[PDB]
Amino acid sequence: GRKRRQTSMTDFYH
């Protein structure tokens, strides 16, 4: 990935 930044859990299945 080239835009991995602040990966919040906006889905509790990923």
Swiss-Prot record:
Residue positions, PTM Phosphothreonine: T7
Domain of life: Eukaryota
Positions of modified residues (Phosphoserine): S8
Result of changing T7A: Reduces phosphorylation by Akt; no change in interaction with PCNA, CDK2 or CDK4; no change in subcellular location
Functional summary from the UniProt entry: Plays an important role in controlling cell cycle progression and DNA damage-induced G2 arrest. Involved in p53/TP53 mediated inhibition of cellular proliferation in response to DNA damage. Also involved in p53-independent DNA damage-induced G2 arrest mediated by CREB3L1 in astrocytes and osteoblasts. Binds to and inhibits cyclin-dependent kinase activity, preventing phosphorylation of critical cyclin-dependent kinase substrates and blocking cell cycle progression. Functions in the nuclear localization and assembly of cyclin D-CDK4 complex and promotes its kinase activity towards RB1.
Subunit structure as annotated in this protein's UniProt entry: Interacts with HDAC1; the interaction is prevented by competitive binding of C10orf90/FATS to HDAC1 facilitating acetylation and protein stabilization of CDKN1A/p21. Interacts with MKRN1. Interacts with PSMA3. Interacts with PCNA. Component of the ternary complex, cyclin D-CDK4-CDKN1A. Interacts (via its N-terminal domain) with CDK4; the interaction promotes the assembly of the cyclin D-CDK4 complex, its nuclear translocation and promotes the cyclin D-dependent enzyme activity of CDK4.
Expression by tissue: Expressed in all adult tissues, with 5-fold lower levels observed in the brain.
Domain notes: The PIP-box K+4 motif mediates both the interaction with PCNA and the recruitment of the DCX(DTL) complex: while the PIP-box interacts with PCNA, the presence of the K+4 submotif, recruits the DCX(DTL) complex, leading to its ubiquitination.
Processing and modification events after translation: Phosphorylation of Thr-7 by Akt or of Ser-8 by PKC impairs binding to PCNA. Phosphorylation of Thr-7 by PIM2 enhances CDKN1A stability and inhibits cell proliferation. Phosphorylation of Thr-7 by PIM1 results in the relocation of CDKN1A to the cytoplasm and enhanced CDKN1A protein stability. Ubiquitinated by MKRN1; leading to polyubiquitination and 26S proteasome-dependent degradation. Ubiquitinated by the DCX(DTL) complex, also named CRL4(CDT2) complex, leading to its degradation during S phase or following UV irradiation. Ubiquitination by the DCX(DTL) complex is essential to control replication licensing and is PCNA-dependent: interacts with PCNA via its PIP-box, while the presence of the containing the 'K+4' motif in the PIP box, recruit the DCX(DTL) complex, leading to its degradation.
Conditions for induction: Activated by p53/TP53, mezerein (antileukemic compound) and IFNB1. Repressed by HDAC1.
Localization, UniProt: Cytoplasm; Nucleus
Short sequence motif Nuclear localization signal: positions: 3-14
Name of protein: Cyclin-dependent kinase inhibitor 1
Originating gene: CDKN1A
Biological classification of the source: Eukaryota, Metazoa, Chordata, Craniata, Vertebrata
Entire protein: shown range: 139 to 152 of 164
Organism the protein comes from: Homo sapiens
